[PDB]
């Protein structure tokens, strides 16, 4: 009863960061050390737990969130960070307990002419609360004039496309990111390492 980590990490297509994908993991055993042992990931950082301790600990629930962002935006996937991704697309709580994994995905997510399928939120009236997800496409009202669905002066479409080109630099590469959240809830432990 191994946890389907290959379902999320080795999935063919990810979601846009504004509409990131969530998968609930329970009722299985997972060797997290095997995940780090493969060295294909560029970022592997954990908060509240050490990587070796994962196999020696149990949790009520596990949550795997998957999306694609830019390279220099991977630093935004961390507690207390700011920026358009952390404030408008995907926010992590200040007391986050879990891990963040990010790896380069240039050969798959980049296309000649620009890959215009991956989007992100540029404008929003207020910051997202932790783990919230906004997928509305209402015209943003940047000024006093009400837009009323009409895009134009001080009235912008809320989403902007990344446009990944294989020839891009390391900062503007498509990076696939997963976030593992670990939940202890005064309930039975359903996800455990080989302990």
């Amino acid at each position, epitope marked *: 009863n191994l946890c389907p980590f290959g379902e999320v990490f080795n999935a063919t297509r990810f979601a846009s960061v504004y509409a990131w994908n969530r998968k609930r993991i329970s009722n299985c055993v997972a060797d997290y050390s095997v995940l780090y042992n493969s060295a294909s990931f560029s970022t592997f950082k954990c908060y509240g737990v050490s990587p070796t301790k994962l196999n020696d600990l149990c949790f009520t629930n596990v949550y795997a969130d998957s999306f694609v962002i830019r390279g220099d935006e991977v630093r935004q996937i961390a507690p207390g960070q700011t920026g358009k991704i952390a404030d408008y697309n995907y926010k992590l709580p200040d007391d986050f307990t879990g891990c963040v994994i990010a790896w380069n995905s240039n050969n798959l997510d980049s296309k000649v002419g620009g890959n215009y399928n991956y989007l992100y939120r540029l404008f929003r009236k207020s910051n997202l609360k*932790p783990f919230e*997800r*906004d997928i509305s496409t209402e015209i943003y009202q940047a000024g006093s004039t009400p837009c009323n669905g009409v895009e134009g002066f001080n009235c912008y479409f809320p989403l902007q496309s990344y446009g990944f080109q294989p020839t891009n630099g390391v900062g503007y590469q498509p990076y696939r990111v997963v976030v593992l959240s670990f939940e202890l809830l005064h309930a039975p432990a359903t996800v455990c390492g080989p302990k």
Partner: antibody
Amino acid sequence: EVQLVQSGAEVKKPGESLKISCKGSGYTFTRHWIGWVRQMPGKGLEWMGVIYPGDSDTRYSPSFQGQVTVSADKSISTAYLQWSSLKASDTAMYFCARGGIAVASGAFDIWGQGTMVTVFN
Amino acid sequence: SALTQPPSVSVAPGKTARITCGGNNIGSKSVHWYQQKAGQAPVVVIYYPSDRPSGIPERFSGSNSENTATLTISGVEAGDEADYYCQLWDTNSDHWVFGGGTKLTVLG
């Protein structure tokens, strides 16, 4: 098991104060919204306000702002709704509902029984 | 902003019921649908697009147009008789907004 358990029904006179409690269990209380919805007998649902117990951020409806207070105590996983002076028009059911996250972000995924508040003159 | 629902809708068992919620640019905003049976607390039946909560049958679905959000129940059963509500998120003002409600009656 996610649950929102609300306080018992109340009978109060006009002008009196009232404070209803609403305790959450089975989930991280500080990582969700908690909102209050009013339902007059035989009428529709009306959102009143919302509080994020993580940082005590409060949002109020224009029709309810200033006439009612929403607060929370995260140490015991409870949210509070408070009136300073009740009116006969306040007789209604009051639901407290948890604000979802992820796909449930804009919705209220979990609800309590509701608290019946009767103002009797 | 005003969210408008027909006060009542009646269908025969086995057919399809469509409940409409109206407004200005609702087709671009996040709209959810709740069911409330008589004497019970409300229950979410549809989130935004057409994502269903865990345990909700596949006969419940949601669709949208520029000025309209529609909840569709195909093959209506008797137990589906209840009040249905559309709810708006309204990211402009951070105001959860509530429809008028529609009583879906299954003709028995």
